[PDB]
A paper describes a structure:
The hydroxycarboxylic acid receptor 2 (HCA2) agonist niacin has been used as treatment for dyslipidemia for several decades albeit with skin flushing as a common side-effect in treated individuals. HCA2 is an important receptor to understand since it regulates homeostasis during physiological and pathophysiological conditions implicated in a variety of diseases, including cardiovascular diseases, multiple sclerosis, Parkinson’s disease, Alzheimer’s disease, neurological diseases and colon cancer. In addition, HCA2 plays crucial role in nutrient sensing and anti-inflammatory effect using various signaling mechanisms. Here, we report the cryo-electron microscopy structure of the HCA2-Gi signalling complex with the potent agonist MK-6892, along with crystal structures of HCA2 in inactive state.
For cryo-EM studies, the stable complex was successfully constituted by co-expressing engineered HCA2 receptor with N-terminus BRIL fusion, agonist MK-6892, Gi (Gαi1β1γ2) protein and antibody fragment ScFv16. The cryo-EM analysis yielded the HCA2-MK-6892-Gi-scFv16 (HCA2-Gi) complex structure at a global resolution of 3.1 Å with most regions of HCA2, MK-6892, Gα, Gβ, Gγ and ScFv16 visible. All transmembrane helices of HCA2 are modeled in the map with the contour level at 3.0 σ. Agonist MK-6892 is modeled into the orthosteric binding pocket below the extracellular loop 2 (ECL2) based on the EM map. The binding pocket is tightly formed by residues from ECL2, helix II, helix III and helix VII, including the hydrophilic interactions between MK-6892 and R1113.36, S178ECL2, S179ELC2 and Q1123.37. The carboxylic group of MK-6892 interacts with R1113.36 by strong ionic interactions. In addition, the residue Q1123.37 forms a hydrogen bond with the hydroxyl group attached to pyridine ring of MK-6892. Firstly, in the binding pocket layer, the agonist MK-6892 triggers the side chain of R1113.36 flip towards the center of orthorsteric binding pocket, which induces the conformational change of L1073.32 and Q1123.37 in helix III. Thus, the synergetic upward movement of F6.48 along with the flipping of R1113.36 initiate the activation of HCA2, resembling the ‘twin toggle switch’ reported in CB1. Among them, HCA2-Gαi is very similar to CB1-Gαi with a small conformation shift of α5 and αN in terms of orientations and movements. In the HCA2-Gi complex structure, the main interaction interface is formed by helix III, helix V, helix VI, intracellular loop 2 (ICL2) and ICL3 of the receptor with α5 and αN of the Gαi protein. The C-terminal helix of Gαi (H5) acts as key interface between HCA2 and Gαi.
Residue numbers in the entry:
A (entry chain A): 5 to 54, 182 to 354
B (entry chain B): 3 to 340
C (entry chain S): 5 to 120, 136 to 245
D (entry chain R): 15 to 298
E (entry chain C): 7 to 63
């Protein structure tokens, strides 16, 4: 090596060092891919933070959370969903006011069924074989008047029991829960929430901690 | 009136089909029945570049056949000296979701883009000695899947909606917009004279656009699935595409039809990158099953296999002098083969 | 830009201090080459990027100490023992080393202080006619052929106009720098090097220096004043 | 110190060949499995598997250095070599046992940080500092065991050319207690680690809905085989120590058979080293 | 917006209709001429010796 070549090797080693510190800084940071059936309940999930993909960088209990929203991509998602293969978790936003409001066509293809189809396309994806889902149900306060004014009949033609909140919400949660096929390698956590609750970040942190210790048991070869 | 237009378009498609049938007197596979095969190509890994820490999604060679750009799933766009395995630059990207790379023919600028829908052009040769964002091109609706430099002034980008654009750099507005596709334009490749370019989208069809005129010249079909990679022939009159049908297809511009289908029963997964060697004899195609095959562009038999990657190959490129082939894969290393 | 330093002292100790202004000081190696008031340029010290490898000339190995502070972009040269040999304008130089780089591109304004083996670069020519519009050629010879195995000769040509700091003209054999007109070319191979000028203006007058960069105790070429 | 007692082997030479042959015959396959999991395989950074590989190479050294012990058991107890393997075997087995215990301890500490304190930055550690801390731990086991190389112990009582620094006696009480100490300090670590993890996974409700119960049972299995294979040696040694401090005077006729029983416990220690990687290969 | 895209598609097929297409055999012979004319400067077809191979060690 010449003098300039030795100095270029030194510069490359300094680039290696700084790049390794940048990668170590980026490693201790969980990634949550935030998906949803349109502008339904993602706004509140951004709202307790305290172009295309938008990134939020909130923190909680000395843990840095990077949450990515790709609802503004509006393209065929199978070509770029492999970029989110290495995320920590998939937050899913499902509105409980999605039924009885069709919002797209005149009579067909209601919001609950396309939310079901998006959830089935996400939880049974070839890349998300082991990432967990922190599926939310974003309409707690609006669900009681929705089931009071109309029974759960325009979707799920089978009976929902009655028009009270508890068993109907449990039916929604159970029908979203059995949708995945790989019951062992991934789990859906199914938190219920409203627009005023501040305990979303605690449940997100708990599910993230569960995913981290499961990944650590993967790393130590004992899981 | 709509049904009359649909019937006239169907009659036009039938006319295009019978014109292609009349122009197809023979095949390339029929002619290459006595040509000398290339044998078996033994390409080994001369260099490996172990600097990235995520899945490499793009790689582009400089026109001096020495410098490399490569983008990963951090904010890292690394420029390597491939001869001495040395990192000459590590550009920090604002958005870590980068799906494409470009190296300018002059080597002054490096372009990036991805899920953030904007094309960031970085000036390498600055008086301040760092890398600065020389331009920020906005206007695409979907994700920016490919970008190629015509020269230091103009850049052709392909987006995740049904458009391609030709931009200007000192004025960040699009010079022209090519809109004839119906699907996500997943690949884009330029002619050596940079007067025409072919874009391949999710409608399983490629389109040949004239850059100066601004409209489509020819439409090429035949693929069952959507195509991910296009490279021109070095002559500039042909191009090979690769899809998720596990079939490369060599189309020719003047014949306005496909010439060859490079397929094998062992491979069933899709093709991610396609690049011709110099003189257009070999065809290095990277597949999803961790490998990278080398076809003969004249006869559909397969040469050697670039089996050295622990994950799937996402990009592959051949130098302008044809010295070596750089394959960037989904593990953090990109390997240089000769 | 970069400037600043010390002044006259009899036989004492002085810290030269220069301040870098806006060119990413942490990524640039820095040289401290010095120029006697009637002699030519000579190399003194070198601090690399991130305070890594440190080099000194053969005469100031123990007396001088070169350091940098990436906070405030500042460069220090502390001299403890002072002799009568090092009364000079001290000309701080930036230089970045990557593949396509142009080292020694920008030079500081230089501060004068008065006190009251190696490759020998000859440059036997010292005076040429000063007439403009001609094609004057300046030759250069070395002791060892500075052709390295990778194929590029590490010989640089600088112009020092009378009054201000020297400016890099070409940063290899036939490698024109930035901001220099296209009237210069390298035209050298091995040991003999031949800088040439297409047309001379009044701004091309000055002293032309050649500098090797093969081995690090690097020597300049004693100047060829037009 | 020739007054220290060491006696014959009343049918110790007839009960040890089964466990020794089983240990060697299974140790060949265990070494092959650990070499497949460490050297033949690839594509894993796996900073915990660095410590697993260190436990594996300690088991490699022990499974290679068993059968000279039964070269010593040809007739009754005769070290047939009579050379520097006598001075090498004691250091080799002592450093192997220290490395096995210390590396099981650091594996338990690593798992304790994996489960109970996941956001601690010691879990996603880099391979280089894990390698240098592996070298530091190996230097800890090496640099304390070098004391047996300057001292030579081929000595015997009547020409039996015995090669062992165990006797029911005392001259400094330095290593015999410290061999005890290497049982007691990990006991306050491993049962500090696993019983916390057993607590923590029982506190976070993740049991009995997924296959967490395998991870529940495996650390408990490691703890119980560790205690049942390193408890009898230490309680027998501390019983001999307290007997010598209380009633073990210079009259040496009533505790002749305790060295035989202690050597059976030593066979338990190296069958523990045998059954070590069978719970570290059948999980990934 | 029902006429416009169909009308654009049909004029695009008009503009793709009267292009001049040579025979596949003639363009195939053109590909033969380019592939065998430049075959002596293909560093991947022929194994380039270590004297002028920049990727050596
Ligand atoms: C263990 C011993 C006495 C050597 C020794 N180890 C230490 C020591 C103690 C504490 C510590 O932290 C480090 N080292 N001091 O001496 C030895 O050779 N035993 C033999 C056998 C065995 O134990 O299997 C099988 C049969 C033949 C004899």
């Amino acid at each position: 090596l010449s003098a300039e070549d030795k100095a270029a090797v030194e510069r490359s080693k300094m680039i290696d060092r700084n790049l390794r510190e940048d990668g170590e800084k980026a490693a201790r940071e969980v990634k949550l891919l935030l998906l949803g059936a349109g502008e339904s309940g993602k706004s509140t999930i951004v709202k307790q933070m305290k172009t295309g993909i938008v990134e939020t960088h909130f923190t909680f209990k000395d843990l840095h959370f990077k949450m990515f929203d790709v609802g503004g991509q509006r393209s065929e998602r199978k070509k770029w969903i492999h970029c989110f293969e290495g995320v920590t978790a998939i937050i899913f936003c499902v509105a409980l006011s999605d039924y009885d409001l069709v919002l797209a066509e005149d009579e067909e293809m209601n919001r609950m069924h396309e939310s079901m189809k998006l959830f089935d396309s996400i939880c049974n994806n070839k890349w998300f074989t082991d990432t967990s889902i922190i599926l939310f149900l974003n309409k707690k306060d609006l669900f009681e008047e929705k089931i009071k004014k109309s029974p759960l009949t325009i979707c799920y033609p089978e009976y929902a029991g009655s028009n009270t909140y508890e068993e109907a919400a449990a039916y929604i949660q159970c029908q979203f829960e059995d949708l995945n096929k790989r019951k062992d390698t991934k789990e859906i956590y199914t938190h219920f929430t409203c627009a005023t609750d501040t305990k979303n970040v605690q449940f997100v942190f708990d599910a993230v901690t569960d995913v981290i210790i499961k990944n650590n048991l993967k790393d130590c070869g004992l899981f | 009136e709509l049904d009359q237009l649909r019937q006239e378009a169907e009659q036009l498609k039938n006319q295009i089909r019978d014109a292609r049938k009349a122009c197809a007197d023979a095949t390339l596979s029929q002619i290459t029945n006595n040509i000398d095969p290339v044998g078996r190509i033994q390409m080994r890994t001369r260099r490996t570049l172990r600097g990235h820490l995520a899945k490499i999604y793009a790689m582009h060679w400089g026109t001096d056949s020495r410098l490399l750009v490569s983008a990963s799933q951090d904010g890292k766009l690394i420029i390597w000296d491939s001869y001495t395995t040395n990192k000459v630059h590590a550009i920090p990207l604002r958005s870590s979701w980068v799906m494409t790379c470009a190296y300018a023919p002059s080597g002054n600028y490096v372009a990036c883009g991805g899920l953030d829908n904007i094309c960031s052009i970085y000036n390498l040769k600055t008086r301040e000695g760092n890398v600065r964002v020389s331009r920020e091109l906005a206007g695409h609706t979907g994700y920016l899947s490919c970008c190629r430099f015509l020269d230091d002034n103009q850049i052709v980008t392909s987006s995740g909606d049904t458009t391609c654009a030709l931009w200007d750099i000192e004025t960040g507005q699009q010079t022209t917009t090519f809109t004839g596709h119906t699907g996500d334009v997943m690949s884009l490749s330029l002619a050596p004279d940079t007067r025409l370019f072919v874009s391949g989208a999710c409608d399983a069809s490629a389109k040949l656009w004239d850059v100066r005129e601004g409209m489509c010249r020819q439409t090429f079909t035949g693929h069952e699935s959507d195509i991910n990679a296009i490279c021109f022939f070095p002559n500039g009159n042909a191009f090979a595409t690769g899809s998720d049908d596990a079939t490369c297809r060599l189309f020719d511009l003047r014949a306005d039809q496909e010439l060859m289908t490079y397929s094998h029963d062992n491979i069933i997964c899709g093709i991610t990158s396609v690049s011709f060697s110099k003189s257009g004899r070999l065809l290095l195609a990277g597949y999803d099953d961790f490998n990278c095959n080398v076809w003969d562009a004249l006869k559909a038999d397969r040469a050697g296999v670039l089996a050295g990657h622990d994950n799937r190959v996402s990009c592959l490129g051949v130098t302008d002098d044809g010295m070596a082939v750089a394959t960037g894969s989904w593990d953090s290393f990109l390997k240089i083969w000769n | 830009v970069e400037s600043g330093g010390g002044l006259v002292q009899p036989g004492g100790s002085r810290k030269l201090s220069c301040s870098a202004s806006g060119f990413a000081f942490s990524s640039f190696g820095m040289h401290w080459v010095r120029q006697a008031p009637e002699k030519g340029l000579e190399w003194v010290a070198y601090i690399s990027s991130g305070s890594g490898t440190i080099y000194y000339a053969d005469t100031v190995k123990g007396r001088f100490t070169i350091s940098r502070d990436d906070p405030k972009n500042t460069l220090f040269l502390q001299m403890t023992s002072l002799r009568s040999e090092d009364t000079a304008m001290y000309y701080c130089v930036r230089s970045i080393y990557y593949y396509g780089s142009s080292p020694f591109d920008f030079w500081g304004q230089g501060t004068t202080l008065t006190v009251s083996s190696d490759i020998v670069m000859t440059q036997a020519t010292s005076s040429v006619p000063v007439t403009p519009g001609e094609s004057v050629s300046i030759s250069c010879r070395s002791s060892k052929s500075l052709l390295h195995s990778n194929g590029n000769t590490y010989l640089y040509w600088f112009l020092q106009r009378p009054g201000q700091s020297p400016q890099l003209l070409i940063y290899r054999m036939s490698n024109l720098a930035s901001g220099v007109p296209d009237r210069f070319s390298g035209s050298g191979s091995g040991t003999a090097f031949t800088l040439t000028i297409s047309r001379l203006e009044a701004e091309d007058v000055g002293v032309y220096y050649c500098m090797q960069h093969l081995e690090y105790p690097l020597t300049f070429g004693a100047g060829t004043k037009l | 110190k020739k007054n220290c007692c060491v006696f014959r082997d009343d049918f110790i030479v007839k009960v040890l060949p089964p466990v020794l042959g089983l240990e060697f015959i299974f140790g060949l396959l265990g070494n092959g499995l650990a070499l497949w999991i460490f050297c033949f395989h690839l594509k894993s950074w796996k900073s915990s598997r660095i410590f697993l590989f260190n436990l594996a190479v300690a088991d490699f050294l022990l499974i290679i250095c068993l059968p000279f012990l039964m070269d010593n058991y040809v007739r009754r107890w005769d070290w047939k070599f009579g050379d520097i393997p006598c001075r090498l075997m004691l250091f080799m087995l002592a450093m192997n046992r220290q490395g096995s215990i210390i590396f099981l301890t650091v594996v338990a500490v690593d798992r304790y940080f994996r489960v109970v304190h996941p956001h601690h930055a010691l879990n996603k550690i880099s391979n280089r500092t894990a390698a240098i801390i592996s070298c530091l731990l190996w230097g800890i086991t090496i640099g304390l065991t070098v004391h047996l190389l300057k001292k030579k112990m081929p000595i015997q009582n009547g020409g039996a050319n015995l090669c062992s620094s165990f006797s029911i006696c005392h001259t400094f009480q330095w290593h015999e207690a410290m061999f005890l100490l290497e049982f007691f300090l990990p006991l306050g670590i491993i049962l500090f680690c696993s019983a916390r993890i057993i607590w923590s996974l029982r506190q976070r409700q993740m049991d009995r809905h997924a296959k967490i119960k395998r991870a529940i049972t495996f650390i408990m299995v490691v703890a119980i085989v560790f205690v049942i294979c390193f408890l009898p040696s230490v309680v027998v040694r501390i019983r001999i120590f307290w007997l010598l401090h209380t009633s073990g005077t210079q009259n040496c006729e009533v505790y002749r058979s305790v060295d035989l029983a202690f050597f059976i416990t030593l066979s338990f220690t190296y069958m523990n080293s045998m059954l070590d990687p069978v719970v570290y290969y059948f999980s990934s | 917006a029902s006429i416009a895209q169909a009308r654009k598609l049909v004029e695009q097929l008009k503009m793709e209709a009267n292009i001049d297409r040579i025979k596949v055999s003639k363009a195939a012979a053109d590909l033969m001429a380019y592939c065998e004319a430049h075959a002596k400067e293909d560093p991947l077809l022929t194994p380039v010796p270590a004297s002028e191979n920049p990727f050596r060690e």
